[PDB]
Amino acid sequence: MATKQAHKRLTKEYKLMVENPPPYILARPNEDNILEWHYIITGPADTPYKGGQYHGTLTFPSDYPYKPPAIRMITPNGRFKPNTRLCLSMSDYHPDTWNPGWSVSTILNGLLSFMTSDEATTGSITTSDHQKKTLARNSISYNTFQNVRFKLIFPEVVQENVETLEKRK
């Protein structure tokens, strides 16, 4: 069981996202484990990610709020190696400078802003703009058929994706 402190904080962080949803970012705790969050980043305009659907996870440790989450991205994307901890300023590569007061939306906006930059970090990969665009186009099919956890966590989005894939055809 998560500590009562962590459970209270992370519940509040979800409510804050419901009340003020950050553009391009949907995220929520697992319904049976408040420490394991899943997110979907929608690729923004003005990037080669435009229209992509990028599933990943923010795994808060048992000692949250005093230790950062592990950040991973599951959907192939051309910027981050899939299923790999990512070295970001607000991540578990940086426990010494962790600020407990960072909100989940702040952490995720840090991931999105890093994604759309070209800075290398542990977990990043090198692809072309064309490869990123192909991965963005194919991300919805990927998450529907090649991503076992996506359907378990986001069944309502799988249902949307099926309709999107049909409308594309």
The catalytic residues are: 87
Name the burial class of residue 14, with classes exposed (0-12), middle (13-18) and buried (19+) by CB atoms within 10 angstroms of its CB. middle
How much of the chain is in helix, strand and coil states, percent to nearest 5? 40, 15, 45
Total domains, the chain: 1
SS3 4: helix
User: Number of helices (H) and strands (E), helices first, in the chain?
Assistant: 5, 4
* Residues of the domain holding 132: 4-168
Which residue is listed with tokens 């989005």? 157
Q: Can you list the positions of beta strands (E) in 33-120?
A: 33-42, 53-59, 70-73
CATH number of domain containing 147: 3.10.110.10
